[PDB]
Design a protein around this ligand. Structure first.
Ligand SMILES: CC[C@@H](Oc1ccc(C(=O)C2CC2)cc1)c1nc(-c2ccc(C(=O)N[C@H](C)CO)c(F)c2)no1
Lengths: 237, 57, 338, 284, 128
């Protein structure tokens, strides 16, 4: 059966070639960082992706920061039931969740909070971290500075809330604007700090749709995530 | 339109399904057992297979 | 009109339920209580195929029971020669979010699709020797969840937009469209005659569809939650289903009602796959608790367990010959038990 | 009863390090990872040392009188010395790896792979084996034979200990201390950041890093320090003729360290602990 | 088949009180977290309140806090929402929704498209 041995040798050669190619592919695949961009349509995520770039069911954007490769996936042209395809994103490095702060009157802020809680408590997404972009700050500042829209109407607890002592307001903001901003941030943090597992954390940020630092922020946040996981393995944290 | 059209289509399809005939459960169970017993000797998993022919050894 | 139509539909559903109950003369367990139990069967892993960088989402056995195909989220579709474990092909995918795969009965084409809303047909036997994208089907509006070959020129696809389709590969246009579901369609299963099929779509209902007539025939509503996996019985007169409620069920096409249910108190994890054996006596079900169970299809007693994996089990499959059963899992390995 | 105690101490090492190594192997096969490889290497280098001890035990268990006793002892000693540097140089590779994995986390994924780990381990073994038999060459580090027994100093001059301590241990101790004390400062900022957010969360509606950096430093420190310090004292002031018995009964600490390496680096990780339990369950 | 039926509703003058009931059949009632949602004319679905399996954890929306109350009776598989001190903005259709899978605390049950596990609803209008 010399033909059997000949075909076996050919098969072994094919296996070796495929193994070499897969080793190269693993090398490339281990050094690329995957991020999932999520957020309501009315939010400014569209402008965010447009700034970062400067019928398909998913959109990909690739960028480089300090010779590091980030691939950002944006989910479009899909229906509004997320309980099945979201599970496909249980390996990404971070979920960039963009929420429009100046959204409270439907009541969009509560819907965003419910979505954040659902993502946070999911079974397959308990090891993923969230980078939270409180977009559209200028609109919120204008609305609260002089207007008839009371956050207390939709969030009664706001009437009994005072700014945290360790607050770093931007120079030039009226105290009410800072109070509203930090109320919203703390509202989002209440969900994040409740779990207590310590496997994943949240990284809040105050951002505008035109901020040019956003890219950098993501970069920095990513580093922290990695570091922390390593510091958890070696019993340092 | 869509709200009432969906209900109309559902009613029509339900009527169509109701037009079908049915069989007793006992006959279906008997047929299933007959098929299960007739081919019981051709399942390598159900009954052990000697290593002479088992390719995965 | 809406109230009247709803009341009429409720009355018709009550009539359907009464008609079904009329035929429930006896239970399958009572009739099958006399047959001899299978006992205990301990399958062992005869192989272990490595090479995937990330977890594994699908696999389909070959028609000859010697080659198999697997898909992963590292953008890789790999064809294994099971007997020796040597790789034959490693196709790279354009989109890394691949959720299903299939292997044509003629062994000349391979299909794959996912979140990109497209189904790609790859040629494995080009004269040049390289695998090339034979066709792309891009008429859906939701993620592709399952697809199967009818022959070398017809493919049935299931998507998450609540409608299945039958495509002519040559022309690239939907020959037929099947509608009637409410939620996302997940699973799919061609009949042995290639004349009918079934589908469970995340609303606790499995519908039976006629391929040539292009319309639904019957609906089964026994489950409580989403349906993830569905399989046809070897004979062609029944099918088994599994859902997130951690219970499997066996429906009969002719009696038009559920026959038996397999479940246990200590199992609270959803089923990801289901498949019968060649004789139809055993029922293998893969779970999220890292091990797959083997049930007696007539006695409904847990007969065996396979516990070689360390993560979620996503795909399972018995061969055409009944020689072995393959399983893939989120740990990036493929095991072949026998 | 020095022979019995030495035998026991050499058997413990072999058993524990072999079991660790087997578990590590299994884990490497199941789950892939470069970080594991260096651990396995350690669990290997920490068992040969025990074997080496066993080889020397038979000499002390009876009369060692012989003509080639010096040709023999030169090889025994050199084996033991070479084997110790294989367990001291392995620890300085886990620290470097796990420090580069935290200081620069974006480059550590684009650089480290299996080939780098293999090359580093080959170089480590070569250098470890080149340091022990070296005294068998150059004669500055040798001593003229007097008796037919075996002792580190009986064959090797104390100048060899002096050079080892001044080019060996201490340079590898300073680096260890710096690495561990910088990772601590890196891990304090993260602790502060994560602790300043739970307070805000609660309002709306620490010692771990210090008890873990001290064990890893104290264990390294109290392994060979006493021996090298004693040797340096002897070299500086030869009048302290009483140092040989001490050096005969002080070296154990060094070899004693091999009973903590497989319990600080391999039994503190969750994967290896769970693996060992799982294997034990099958053993029962 | 999962069946959910809402009862109680109609017309109420401002400042009154009302009680909505939801009856469930076709599934093990005690294993599923449940909630009440609502839809006002010209507006999409909104989340009103939710309750867990055993009732230990309860949540309400901000605009409702201190007014409504949600309870569940697992002995007879029923859900109750007691509302008081109504206002004109509460005029809407109320739906009784269930989380998709059991033994979990994640939920995706507000989707505008046809959600397969919610009842037909009950109409409540508050006006002079
Ligand atoms: C020389 C110190 C130590 O070896 C090393 C320490 C550190 C390093 C490094 O830092 C290098 C970077 C890697 C290298 C080698 C050693 N001592 C002994 C030893 C063995 C036996 C006796 C003895 O006489 N025993 C009698 C017969 C029983 O009563 C002894 F005195 C010393 N082996 O290794």
């Amino acid at each position: 059966t010399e033909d059997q041995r000949n075909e076996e040798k050919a098969q072994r050669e094919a296996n070796k070639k495929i193994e070499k190619q897969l080793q190269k592919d693993k090398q490339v695949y281990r050094a690329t960082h995957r991020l999932l961009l999520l957020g309501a349509g009315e939010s400014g995520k569209n402008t965010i992706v447009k700034q970062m770039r400067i019928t398909s069911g998913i959109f990909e954007t690739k960028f480089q920061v300090d010779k590091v490769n980030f691939h950002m996936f944006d989910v479009g042209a899909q229906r509004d039931e997320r309980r099945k395809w979201i599970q496909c994103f249980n390996d990404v490095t971070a979920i960039i969740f963009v929420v429009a702060s100046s959204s409270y009157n439907t009541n969009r802020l509560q819907a965003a909070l419910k979505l954040f809680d659902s993502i946070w408590n999911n079974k397959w997404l308990r090891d993923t971290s969230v980078i939270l972009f409180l977009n559209k700050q200028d609109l919120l500042a204008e609305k609260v500075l002089a207007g008839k829209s009371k956050i207390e109407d939709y969030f009664p607890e706001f009437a009994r809330y005072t700014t945290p002592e360790d607050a770093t307001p931007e120079p030039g903001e009226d105290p009410r604007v800072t109070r509203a901003k930090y109320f919203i941030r703390d509202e989002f943090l209440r969900i994040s700090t409740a779990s207590g597992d310590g496997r994943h954390y949240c990284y809040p940020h105050f951002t505008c749709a035109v901020d040019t630092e956003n890219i950098r922020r993501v970069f920095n946040d990513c580093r922290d995530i990695i570091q922390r996981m390593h510091l958890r393995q070696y019993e340092l944290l | 339109t869509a709200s009432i059209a969906q209900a109309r289509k559902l009613v029509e399809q339900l009527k169509m399904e109701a037009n079908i005939d049915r069989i007793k459960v006992s006959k279906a169970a008997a047929d299933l057992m007959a098929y299960c017993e007739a081919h019981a000797k051709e399942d390598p998993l159900l009954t052990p297979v000697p290593a002479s022919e088992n390719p995965f050894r | 009109e809406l109230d009247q139509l709803r009341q009429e539909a409720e009355q018709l559903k009550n009539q359907i339920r009464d008609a079904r109950k009329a035929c429930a003369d006896a239970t399958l367990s009572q009739i099958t209580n006399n047959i001899d139990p299978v006992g205990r069967i301990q399958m062992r892993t005869r192989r272990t195929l490595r090479g995937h960088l990330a977890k594994i989402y699908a696999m389909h056995w070959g028609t000859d029971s010697r080659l198999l195909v697997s898909a992963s989220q590292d953008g890789k579709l790999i064809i294994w020669d099971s007997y020796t474990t040597n790789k034959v092909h490693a196709i790279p995918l354009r989109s890394s979010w691949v959720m299903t795969c299939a292997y044509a009965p003629s062994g000349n084409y391979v299909a794959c699709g996912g979140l990109d809303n497209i189904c790609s047909i790859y040629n494995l036997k080009t004269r040049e020797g390289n695998v090339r994208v034979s066709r792309e089907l891009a008429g859906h509006t939701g993620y592709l969840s399952c697809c199967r070959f009818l022959d070398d020129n017809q493919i049935v696809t299931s998507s998450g937009d609540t409608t299945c389709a039958l495509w002519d590969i040559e022309t690239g246009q939907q020959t037929t469209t099947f509608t009637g579901h409410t939620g996302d369609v997940m699973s799919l299963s061609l009949a042995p005659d290639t004349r009918l099929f079934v589908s469970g779509a995340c609303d606790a209902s499995a519908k039976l569809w006629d391929v040539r007539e292009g319309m639904c025939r019957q609906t089964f509503t026994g489950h409580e939650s989403d349906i993830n996996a569905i399989c046809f019985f070897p004979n062609g007169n029944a099918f088994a289903t599994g859902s997130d409620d951690a219970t499997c069920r066996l429906f009969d096409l002719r009696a038009d009602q559920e026959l038996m249910t397999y479940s246990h108190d200590n199992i609270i994890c959803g089923i990801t796959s289901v498949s019968f054996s060649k004789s139809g006596r055993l029922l293998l079900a893969g779970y999220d608790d890292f091990n797959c169970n083997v049930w007696d299809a007539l006695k409904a007693d847990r007969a065996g367990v396979l516990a070689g994996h360390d993560n979620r089990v996503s795909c399972l499959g018995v061969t055409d010959d009944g020689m072995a059963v393959a399983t893939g899992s989120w740990d990036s390995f493929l095991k072949i038990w026998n | 009863s020095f022979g019995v105690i030495l035998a026991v101490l050499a058997s413990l090492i072999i058993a524990t390090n072999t079991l660790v190594a087997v578990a590590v192997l299994l884990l490497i096969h199941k789950n892939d990872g470069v970080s594991l490889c260096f651990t396995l290497n350690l669990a290997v280098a920490d068992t040969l040392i025990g074997v080496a001890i066993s080889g020397l035990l038979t000499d002390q268990l009876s009369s060692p009188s012989r003509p080639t006793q010096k040709t023999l002892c030169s090889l025994r000693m050199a084996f033991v010395t070479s084997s110790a540097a294989a367990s001291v140089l392995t620890v300085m590779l886990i620290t470097f790896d796990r420090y580069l994995a935290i200081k620069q986390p974006f480059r550590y994924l684009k650089i480290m792979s299996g080939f780098v780990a293999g090359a580093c381990i080959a170089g480590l073994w070569l250098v470890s084996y080149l340091i022990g038999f070296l005294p068998l060459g150059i004669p500055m580090f040798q001593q003229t034979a007097y008796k037919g027994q075996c002792s580190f100093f009986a064959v090797f001059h104390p100048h060899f200990v002096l050079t080892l301590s001044c080019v060996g241990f201490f340079p590898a101790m300073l680096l260890f201390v710096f690495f561990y004390c910088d990772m601590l400062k890196i891990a304090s900022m993260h602790s502060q950041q994560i602790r300043k957010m739970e307070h805000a969360g609660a309002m709306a509606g620490d010692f771990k890093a210090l008890r873990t950096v001290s064990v890893l430093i104290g264990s390294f420190a109290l392994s060979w320090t006493p021996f090298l310090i004693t040797g340096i004292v002897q070299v500086a002031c030869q009048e302290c003729h009483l140092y040989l018995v001490l050096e005969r009964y002080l070296w154990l600490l060094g070899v004693g360290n091999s009973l903590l390496n497989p319990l600080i680096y391999a039994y503190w990780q969750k994967e290896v602990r769970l693996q060992l339990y799982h294997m034990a369950l099958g053993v029962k | 088949q999962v069946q959910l039926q809402e009862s109680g509703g109609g017309l109420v003058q401002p400042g009154g009180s009302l009680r909505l009931s939801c009856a469930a059949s076709g599934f093990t009632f005690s294993n599923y977290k449940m909630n009440w949602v609502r839809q006002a004319p010209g507006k999409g679905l909104e989340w009103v309140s939710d309750i867990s399996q055993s009732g230990a954890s309860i949540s309400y929306t901000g605009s409702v806090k201190g007014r409504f109350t949600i309870s569940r009776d697992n002995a007879k598989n029923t859900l109750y929402l007691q509302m008081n001190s109504l206002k004109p903005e509460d005029t809407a259709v109320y739906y009784c929704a269930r989380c998709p899978a059991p033994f979990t605390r994640d939920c995706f049950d507000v989707t505008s498209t046809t959600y397969a596990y919610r009842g037909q609803g009950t109409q409540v209008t508050v006006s002079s």
